[PDB]
């Protein structure tokens, strides 16, 4: 849920099935943005849904789910990565090569 | 020779389905909603009318609007009747309890001969009498104490 | 109003309550009679008689008292001009209360209050049409029978006229406001043209609800709910007095007393649904701010209102209970037009009927019938005790005179009025009043004689 | 022991824990809370002396405590109390005629006569050593707000007393302008000369109505039309204020919605405008009479005619308990004044506030009746000798 | 019922302690307020145990009995009897309490004489009927010749205020009470005479205002005095209206439309004030509160604005200025405006009040009570309320009787003359009724300290042969003529003392059983 | 919302308006950013990528002593005569060295 007072008025029949498809397409949008750099290990601090695990499965990506904040700052110095908080703003310098 | 209309509907102005939000945009359509809420209740009273049903019985309450409508049309009503009494009333007059007022006809209304409201024991009682096809009865007990009539009911 | 935690005495409370709900005149005498049947059964219990055998003997003895009570009974009430048997019947009920200062005035109030509201075709009297109101101040002689209704007048404008000579009463049940629906609306306003449409909607609504009353020719309005401040000044500009916040059954009495109809909306107002009334005014009582409604003139009303005044609230709440017993004995005359003669005259005559049939035959229940006749003499000998006389001296004189000749209406009184003839002293009681005094006291004795165990608990906790 | 210049003060500690030092007889009896029903009537006697005269309030208990004490021997001599009440009225009607012959008719134009009257009431208080400053300030605070030789009444609610902790009683001031205890947001300027003060009762915030108002957002660019139109709304309010020509704004304290938002504060700081918040609704009568401003409710009527004027409107950064505002000089000043009371402790300021009110009430009695008598037990001896000869 | 008691926590008594507790509890009520009867009687000071005790001195017998809270069951009948006497006529609440207690004290003397209690009721009903004819035949009517009726009204207020705290103020407070009801010129509403109590000053400094006083002073930047103004009052909402449509919101799409709605809201509030000033007025009184947006509109037009006076404050202004409430402003030709001369503000006790000096059709008054303490002002307000209520009914019923003990000896003479024409069963109860009527001048005579055993004996010897106007002179302590001294009371006040005490003593004497129930939360 | 196609454009707008202010206060040469409010985890990415120091939740009394001593202007919002995002970049503070020891 976003940080607002978002409420949708569903009047037609096709509107409820469209919202549940836009929730699936939003996960596919951010999963397509992180595979443009061709990674191997995706490590985050928050939850990963099953739809996000589906795109990383066929792309052969090992995902770790709930690593701590203090452990993410420690692996950022060991592998040379940069902790990003935006999947569509990923760059080639944010990938921790050399591990 | 009255006719009894056994109902399971509310005769109040505030009959709400508890999920309706009537969003209006202008003041010309705002008055049309309030006129429609009276026209919903008055259409139900016209279905009870023009059928001979001078006596109205319903287990659901009747507001001040439908009470004054039957007083002007010289009709009697009785709201908040218990469900055990309406089941006995259905077998007495030989009618049927109609929840929807749109299907009212001569085959669903009752028929009796004497219908009065007496003053037995101080409290009023609306008694039905005269129907020959009566598959039920009512035994009114009169005693001098509440424990006296409970023993008389147990006996 | 007692705190008696005794299950035998609790049945005496429901016995006096059952007499009040059915007849409502002998609630005091039905408890002394029930205690008299049990006192005579105490000496019969020591002789070895079974308690059900005493109870079966009281049923055969009370049956003689019912058939003997229907011997002399006649009334000539026609509710037109022969109200003289109706006034003297109500004086017997009001003679024992504290309204003996108004013994002739208040007795005529309860007679005319019943006959104007009773349906003589069905012989049914409805006490919802008789409103009994009370206000402190004045005296007991200021109690008047107001043909109409008496409500608390709540004129929202202080400059309203306090006297209407000819009132075309417009009874309505809609509050003076823009019409609010019963459901959730959440009306949306988008532009400034919709907000200016909100001002013209309410300005024309208050001019529509005022003009629809004036087009019917009405000059008085009754409303169940409240008024708006904008609607208050429109009443004064159009010369339309109106009251505010009247109760539920109060406006139901206005439409019967004035002959009008209660209208739900403002659009259904017409000249046929208006009520007719005469002097409509409010009367201030001393230094208070009540200003009750007084309706002097009417036209064939079927609803009256008795306004009881007094010196304190103790004399008013008792007069509400005293006059209610006077309204019940007139109701019992329409249900049954047969009367008896009180003052202990009917109890002595019924005691002689059980003693004559105790010897026809004295097989088993001879002692049970003589205990019934000795207990029927407790009610006239209690009148001799309260009047300063002697019980056994006065009762032996009256009972012997009914055997030596044909039994007249022979009782007693306090000042004794000269002779002891109840027909000349006009002590008249209803037949079904004393018929239910013997019937209810016998059945309550049977339920307290046919009990041989008590299973009460001990302490409260 | 609390009467006269050689009297000592009393300290009453209540059940809450707020112990105050008081010498005035009205303030002592209201804090003692006597449980006797006859002694509570003597508390209300000193209360009405503070209302009518203001400077009679220990002496009304000494008289009424001795008039009943003289009735001890009268009730033990067979005299009915109705006879004592008849004779006390005859001694009262003869008592005013003795005090009227001792009175000297004075005029309010003589400052030396009014100075000796205010110095007499201060000799019994703790400020008797400060009578060289407080007693001249008590006369000038009255004779400039009464408009004399035209009226026989004076309201003491037009004289505000500000209690601030710090310094000594010699640091008191008689500033004729407005003194506010609120802070300045933002406090980057805190000084403006030739200031024009305006009282604003409008709320400089987001637009909202008395009716329920909601914003419908159902578009991508509709979120841009919410924030940027709210910035352009309050910019039209600040530029309407800035084009008027005022430099000091006084915003009334709003309870329903926010009076001054953070967006409205940033535009008023760039226009070099001193803003003061949290002005109470009961204090706007004293502001408009002192400076000469008018209460502006709607922004369309905010013109230059409803503004005030001030030669100096600065926030005096005090060394003691914070800081306050002080407006110095205004065109056409009203009949209001403000007295700033200092003190080393919180108990001395509460006594100095009651002693100043006992000094302003002395000059209040000279407006109603322009007559005075000798003090220091002088008229009590003449009331004792003339009524003794009247009793013979 | 005491033997084999079938009650849980309730007790009762029959004919032994029933009349014993009824006669003890009723005499002790009458002996309490016995010292407050007459022009020389003392007053009481009422106090509580604590927790905002709020001491209230009263001499009137109704205010004493309504605050004591008697636990006796039969004593509550006499407490409720004096409550109706204050609400109906407003005077004689002390006289009806002593008279109802002296009847039961004489009825306690008939306990040992073995008189039946129903004989005493029948003996007192004939005694009360003989006492009604004594007051009705001795009532003095006043029709025309109004210079004798205004002199008769000053004797009514002089008799009522003589038994109160206003003893040596009859030269002033009689004129404050007669002229207050005389300025009503109609019905006795008893609310147009607004009494304002202010501390400071003596009772001689009190006065009757020629106009009207009010609070909630005139705005912020509005004029304080307007000469020859037209007063228009109102009972309408000024700002934050939320006008009568419950369930109406402002659903817009952008914040620029909210600025257009709130400007349209202030334009309709400005147009409402523009409809008010089309009448051509200079003063405005609203019963509701006036906020800042219409207050600037009245100040710019030079119009006063009195906000939130009172709910009953607009009623007194409508009776003192001759206008109407006028809660709707859409017809200036159908709204009647008030009239005044000066709306200057006066200062009474360091408080600025709005003085409506020089009003036309002023059927309302304002009494400015000034006293030494708050206890005197609370007593003088109830003392003036006991004087204005009798004069509001003396103008409705002009029949007056001679008070000061003269009316009680006329009533006691008619009972004693008919007590000798009765048999001995009821004649003893009628003699006890006449002895209780003679106790009412005996309490007045003994409260001053006079010889009450001889003055009532001189009144009984005077009324036995002529002297229908002979009464008790409390000034010198002798017997004088009541028509010369001018000590008169109203007929309806003296009738309600006789009639309500005879009805209340009838109830308590007929009680033979006091069955009190078990109280709640009392252990 | 009445159309499901306009759902993701509103959800992305809550961060695009946020990142719009963070790019125009950072491209003008600002390296040290002090904030008395709160900087969440999404906004911390734009300072690590650009190589800037961002200090959050500082005291209001400490910000006034820094801005007066370094010549910075205590800004609360957007301003300067109906501008979208101007920030008045000539009113930035100066420092010789900002070092966390
Ligand atoms: N004038 C009279 N003479 C003789 N007896 C009377 C007279 N008036 C009333 N009574 C008697 O007083 C009794 C009062 O009974 P009451 O207590 O009213 O009964 P209830 O409690 O059922 O109303 C009556 O039974 C009647 O016989
Ligand atoms: N300089 C002085 N010399 C002698 N007596 C003084 C002097 N100053 C004040 N007093 C006396 O001190 C008394 C103070 O009375 P005070 O307590 O102020 O009365 P109140 O309580 O009514 O204000 C006065 O009665 C006055 O006679
Ligand atoms: N000037 C007078 N001369 C003689 N008697 C007086 C005079 N003034 C008052 N009284 C008597 O004092 C009594 C006061 O009664 P009061 O306590 O006022 O009764 P209530 O409490 O019912 O008003 C009156 O009954 C009256 O007869
Ligand atoms: Mg009876
Ligand atoms: Mg002093
Ligand atoms: Mg009196």
């Amino acid at each position: 849920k976003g940080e607002s007072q978002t409420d949708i008025e569903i009047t037609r029949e096709e509107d409820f099935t469209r919202i549940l498809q836009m929730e699936e397409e939003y996960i596919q949008q951010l999963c397509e943005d992180i595979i443009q750099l061709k990674p191997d290990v995706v490590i985050t601090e928050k939850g990963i849904s099953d739809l996000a695990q589906h795109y990383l499965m066929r792309a052969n990506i090992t995902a770790i789910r709930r690593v701590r904040k203090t452990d993410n700052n420690r692996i950022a110095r060991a592998c040379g990565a940069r902790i990003v908080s935006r999947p569509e703003e990923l760059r080639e310098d944010d990938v921790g090569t050399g591990a | 020779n009255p006719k009894i209309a056994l109902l399971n509907v509310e005769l109040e102005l505030k009959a709400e389905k508890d999920n309706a939000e009537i969003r209006v945009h202008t003041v010309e359509d705002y008055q049309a909603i309030v006129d429609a809420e009276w026209n919903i209740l008055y259409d139900k009273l016209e279905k009870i009318h023009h059928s001979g049903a001078k006596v109205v019985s319903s287990k659901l309450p009747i507001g001040d609007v439908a009470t004054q409508y039957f007083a002007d049309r010289d009709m009697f009503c009785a709201g908040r009747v218990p469900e055990e009494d309406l089941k006995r009333t259905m077998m007495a007059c030989g009618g049927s309890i109609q929840t929807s007022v749109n299907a009212l006809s001569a085959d669903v209304l009752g028929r009796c001969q004497v219908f009065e409201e007496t003053q037995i024991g101080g409290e009023r009682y609306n008694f039905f009498t005269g129907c020959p096809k009566a598959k039920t009865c009512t035994f009114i007990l009169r005693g001098g104490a509440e424990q006296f009539m409970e023993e008389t009911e147990r006996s | 109003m007692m705190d008696v935690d005794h299950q035998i005495a609790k049945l005496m409370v429901e016995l006096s309550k059952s007499q009040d709900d059915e007849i409502g005149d002998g609630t005091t005498g039905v408890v002394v009679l029930a205690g008299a049947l049990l006192e005579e059964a105490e000496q019969l219990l020591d002789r070895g008689i079974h308690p059900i055998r005493i109870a079966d003997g009281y049923e055969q003895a009370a049956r003689v008292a019912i058939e003997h009570l229907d011997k002399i009974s006649d009334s000539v009430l026609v509710d037109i001009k022969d109200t003289e048997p109706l006034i003297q019947t109500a004086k017997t009920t009001l003679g024992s209360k504290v309204v003996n200062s108004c013994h002739r005035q208040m007795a005529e109030i309860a007679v005319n209050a019943v006959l104007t509201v009773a349906d003589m075709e069905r012989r049914d009297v409805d006490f919802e049409l008789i409103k009994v109101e009370g206000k402190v101040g004045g005296r007991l002689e200021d109690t008047k029978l107001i043909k109409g209704v008496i409500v608390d007048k709540d004129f929202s404008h202080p400059q309203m006229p306090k006297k209407v000579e000819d009132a075309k009463i417009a009874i309505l049940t809609c509050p003076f406001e823009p019409p609010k629906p019963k459901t959730k609306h959440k009306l949306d306003v988008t532009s400034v043209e919709d907000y200016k449409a909100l001002q013209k909607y309410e300005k024309e609504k208050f001019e529509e609800m005022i003009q629809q009353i004036k087009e019917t020719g009405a000059n008085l309005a009754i409303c169940q709910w409240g008024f708006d401040d904008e609607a208050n000044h429109l009443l004064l500009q159009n010369n339309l007095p109106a009251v505010r916040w009247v109760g539920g059954p109060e406006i139901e009495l206005i439409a019967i007393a004035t002959g009008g109809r209660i209208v739900p909306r403002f659009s259904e107002l017409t000249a046929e649904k208006l009520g007719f009334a005469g002097l409509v005014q409010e009367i201030s009582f001393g230094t208070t701010k009540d200003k009750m409604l007084v309706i002097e003139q009417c036209k064939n009303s079927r609803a009256v209102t008795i306004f009881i005044r007094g010196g304190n609230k103790m004399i008013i709440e008792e007069a509400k209970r005293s006059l209610h017993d006077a309204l019940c004995v007139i109701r019992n005359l329409i249900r049954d037009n047969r009367v008896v003669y009180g003052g202990g005259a009917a109890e002595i005559s019924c005691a002689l009927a059980v003693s004559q049939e105790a010897d026809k035959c004295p097989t088993l229940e001879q002692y049970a019938m003589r205990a019934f006749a000795d207990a029927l003499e407790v009610i006239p000998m209690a009148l001799s005790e309260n009047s300063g006389m002697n019980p056994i001296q006065t009762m032996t004189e009256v009972r012997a005179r009914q055997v030596k000749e044909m039994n007249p209406a022979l009782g007693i009184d306090c000042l004794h009025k000269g002779t002891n003839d109840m027909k000349q002293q006009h002590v008249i009681e209803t037949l079904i009043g004393k018929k239910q005094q013997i019937s209810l006291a016998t059945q309550m004795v049977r339920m307290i004689l046919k009990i041989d165990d008590i299973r009460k608990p001990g302490e409260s906790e | 022991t609390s009467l006269g210049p050689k009297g000592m003060d009393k300290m009453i500690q209540d059940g809450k824990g707020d112990v105050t030092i008081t010498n005035d007889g009205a303030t002592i009896l209201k804090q003692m809370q006597v449980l006797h029903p006859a002694a509570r009537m003597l508390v209300e006697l000193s209360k009405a002396q503070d209302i009518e005269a203001g400077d009679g309030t220990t002496s009304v208990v000494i008289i009424a405590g001795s008039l009943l004490d003289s009735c001890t021997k009268l009730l033990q001599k067979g005299i009915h109390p109705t006879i004592i009440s008849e004779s006390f009225q005859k001694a009262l009607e003869k008592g005013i005629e003795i005090l009227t012959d001792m009175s000297r008719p004075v005029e309010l134009s003589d400052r030396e006569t009014l100075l000796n009257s205010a110095t007499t009431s201060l000799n019994s208080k703790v400020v008797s050593q400060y009578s060289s400053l407080l007693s001249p300030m008590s006369v000038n605070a009255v004779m400039k707000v009464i408009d004399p030789a035209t009226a026989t009444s004076v309201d003491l609610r037009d004289i505000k007393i500000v209690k601030k902790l710090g310094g000594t009683i010699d640091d008191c001031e008689l500033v004729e302008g407005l003194v506010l205890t609120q802070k300045v947001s933002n406090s980057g300027i805190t000084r403006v000369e030739k200031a024009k003060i305006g009282l604003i009762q409008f709320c400089l915030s987001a637009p909202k109505t008395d009716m329920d108002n909601q914003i419908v957002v159902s578009d991508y660019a509709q979120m841009d039309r919410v924030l940027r139109e709210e910035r352009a709304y309050i910019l039209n309010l600040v530029k309407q204020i800035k084009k008027t020509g005022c430099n000091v704004l006084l915003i009334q304290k709003s309870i329903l919605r926010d009076a001054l938002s953070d967006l409205a504060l940033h535009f008023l700081n760039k226009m070099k405008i001193m803003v003061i918040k949290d002005i109470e609704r009961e204090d706007i009568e004293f502001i408009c009479k002192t400076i000469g401003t008018k209460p502006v409710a709607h922004i369309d009527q905010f013109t230059a005619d409803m503004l005030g004027s001030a030669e100096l409107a600065e926030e005096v950064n005090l060394n003691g308990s914070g800081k306050l505002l002080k407006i110095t000089g205004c065109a056409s000043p009203g009949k209001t004044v403000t007295i700033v009371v200092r003190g080393s402790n919180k108990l001395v300021i509460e006594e100095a506030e009651r002693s100043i009110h006992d000094a302003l009430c002395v000059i209040r009695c000279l407006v109603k009746k322009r007559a005075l008598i000798a003090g220091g037990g002088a008229p009590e001896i003449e009331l004792a000798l003339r009524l003794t000869e009247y009793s013979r | 019922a005491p033997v084999n008691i079938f009650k849980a926590g309730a007790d009762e008594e029959r004919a032994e302690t029933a009349r014993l507790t009824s006669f003890i509890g009723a005499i002790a009520i009458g002996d309490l307020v016995k010292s407050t009867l007459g022009p020389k009687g003392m007053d009481k000071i009422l106090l509580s145990s604590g927790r905002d005790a709020s001491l209230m001195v009263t001499n009137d017998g109704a205010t004493i009995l309504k605050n004591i809270g008697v636990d006796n069951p039969a004593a509550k009948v006499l407490v409720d009897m004096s409550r109706v006497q204050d609400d109906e006529v407003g005077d004689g609440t002390t006289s009806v309490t002593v008279l109802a207690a002296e009847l039961l004290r004489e009825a306690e003397s008939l306990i040992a004489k073995k008189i039946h209690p129903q004989t005493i009721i029948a003996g007192w009903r004939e005694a009360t009927k003989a006492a009604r004819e004594a007051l009705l035949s001795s009532a003095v009517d006043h029709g025309s010749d109004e210079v004798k009726f205004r002199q008769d009204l000053m004797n009514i207020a002089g008799t009522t205020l003589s038994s109160k705290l206003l003893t040596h103020h009859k030269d002033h407070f009689t004129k404050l009470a007669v002229e207050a009801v005389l300025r009503l010129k109609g019905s006795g509403n008893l609310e147009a005479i607004h009494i304002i109590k202010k501390l400071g000053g003596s009772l001689a400094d009190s006065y009757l205002d020629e106009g009207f006083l009010l609070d909630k002073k005139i705005g912020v930047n509005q004029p304080k005095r307007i000469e020859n103004a037209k007063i228009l009052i109102a009972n309408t909402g000024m700002d934050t209206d939320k006008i009568k449509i419950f369930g109406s919101r402002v659903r817009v799409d952008s914040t620029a439309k909210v600025a257009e709605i709130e400007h349209a809201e202030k334009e309709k509030m400005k147009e409402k004030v523009e409809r008010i000033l089309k009448h051509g007025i200079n003063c405005f009184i609203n019963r509701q509160l006036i906020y800042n947006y219409p207050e600037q509109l009245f100040g710019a037009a030079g119009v006063m604005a009195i906000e939130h006076a009172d709910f009953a404050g607009v009623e007194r202004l409508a009776l003192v200025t001759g206008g109407e409430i006028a809660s709707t402003f859409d017809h200036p030709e159908l709204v009647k405006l008030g009239s005044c001369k000066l709306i200057e503000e006066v200062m009474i006790g360091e408080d600025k009040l709005i003085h409506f000096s020089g009003v036309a059709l002023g059927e309302a008054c304002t009494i400015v009570l000034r006293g030494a303490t708050q206890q005197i002002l609370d007593e003088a307000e109830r003392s003036l309320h006991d004087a204005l209520c009798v004069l509001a009914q003396t103008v409705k019923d002009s029949r007056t009787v001679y008070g000061g003990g003269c009316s009680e000896m006329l009533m006691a003479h008619a009972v004693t003359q008919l007590a000798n024409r009765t048999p001995g069963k009821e004649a003893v109860a009628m003699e006890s009724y006449a002895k209780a009527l003679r106790m009412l001048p005996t309490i007045i005579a003994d409260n001053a300290g006079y010889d009450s055993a001889d003055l009532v004996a001189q009144l009984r010897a005077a009324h036995s042969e002529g002297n229908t106007t002979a009464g008790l002179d409390m000034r010198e302590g002798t017997i004088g003529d009541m028509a010369i001294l001018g000590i008169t009371e109203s007929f309806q006040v003296k009738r309600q003392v006789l009639l309500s005490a005879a009805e209340a003593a009838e109830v308590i004497l007929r009680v033979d059983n006091i069955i009190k129930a078990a109280p709640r939360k009392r252990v | 919302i009445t159309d499901p196609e306009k759902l993701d454009q509103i959800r992305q707008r809550e961060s695009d308006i946020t990142k719009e202010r963070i790019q125009k206060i950072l491209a003008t040469g600002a390296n040290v950013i002090l904030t008395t409010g709160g900087i969440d985890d999404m906004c911390l990415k734009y300072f690590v990528e650009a190589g800037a120091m961002a200090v959050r939740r500082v005291l209001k009394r400490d910000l006034k002593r820094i801005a007066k001593a370094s010549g910075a202007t205590i800004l609360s919002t957007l301003a300067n005569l109906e501008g979208e995002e101007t920030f008045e970049a000539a009113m930035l503070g100066q420092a010789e060295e900002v070092v966390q020891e």
Side-chain angles (χ1 to χ4, degrees), chain C residues 3 5 138 141 159 180 186-187 189-190 192 195 199 202 228-230 233 286-287 289 311-313 386, chain E residues 6-8 80 84 87-88 116 132 191 243-244 247 249 251 265 268 288 323-324 327-328 496 518:
Chain C
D3 286 6
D5 48 329
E141 298 183 357
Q159 295 197 354
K180 177 176 59 181
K186 301 179 177 182
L187 165 67
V189 179
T190 305
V192 297
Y195 199 85
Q199 188 195 29
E202 313 173 35
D228 199 7
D229 297 332
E230 191 178 356
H233 187 40
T287 80
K289 296 175 59 180
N312 41 13
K313 70 182 178 181
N386 298 329
Chain E
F6 35 75
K7 305 178 183 303
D80 194 82
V84 185
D87 295 1
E88 180 179 1
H116 198 282
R132 289 178 187 177
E191 276 197 325
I243 29 254
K244 307 306 154 300
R249 61 150 63 98
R251 195 168 185 87
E265 289 188 347
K268 298 308 175 180
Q288 307 185 16
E324 36 187 314
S327 310
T328 306
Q496 285 295 137

Side-chain angles (χ1 to χ4, degrees), chain E residues 15 19 33 43 152 159 192 194 210 239 290 294 305 368 405 469-470 474 497:
Chain E
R19 260 176 275 98
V33 295
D43 312 328
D152 186 66
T159 315
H194 180 49
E210 302 181 5
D239 203 307
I290 300 178
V368 194
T469 61
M474 65 295 293
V497 170

Side-chain angles (χ1 to χ4, degrees), chain A residues 37-96:
Chain A
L37 310 170
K38 302 177 181 180
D40 291 320
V41 174
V42 166
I43 287 178
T44 180
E45 294 171 60
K46 268 76 181 179
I48 293 182
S49 60
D50 300 7
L51 295 169
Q53 297 167 35
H54 175 62
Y55 196 86
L56 298 180
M57 173 178 59
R58 59 181 180 180
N60 301 329
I61 310 298
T62 297
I64 321 291
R65 185 199 297 267
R66 209 164 297 272
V67 195
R68 220 99 55 87
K69 187 182 180 179
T70 60
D71 301 334
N72 277 257
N73 295 317
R74 192 172 62 251
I75 196 179
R77 299 301 177 183
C79 303
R82 292 179 179 265
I83 302 177
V84 298
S85 52
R86 206 74 177 272
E88 62 267 13
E89 293 179 351
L90 256 176
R91 296 174 69 254
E92 295 184 356
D93 297 333
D94 306 333
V95 183

Side-chain angles (χ1 to χ4, degrees), chain E residues 36-39 59-62 85 90-96 158-160 162-164 386 403-405 408 444 472-474 482 487 489 493-494 497:
Chain E
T36 62
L37 183 59
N59 190 267
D60 186 64
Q85 191 78 11
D91 201 6
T93 66
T94 317
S95 300
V96 81
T159 315
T160 310
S162 60
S163 61
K164 291 302 180 62
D386 289 359
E408 282 80 14
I444 297 176
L472 178 61
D473 189 16
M474 65 295 293
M482 291 293 108
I487 310 177
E489 300 194 24
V493 178
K494 278 299 184 186
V497 170

Side-chain angles (χ1 to χ4, degrees), chain D residues 24 55 120-122 124-125 358 362:
Chain D
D24 198 10
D55 199 4
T120 307
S121 59
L122 297 182
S124 60
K125 310 300 176 183
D358 286 0
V362 163

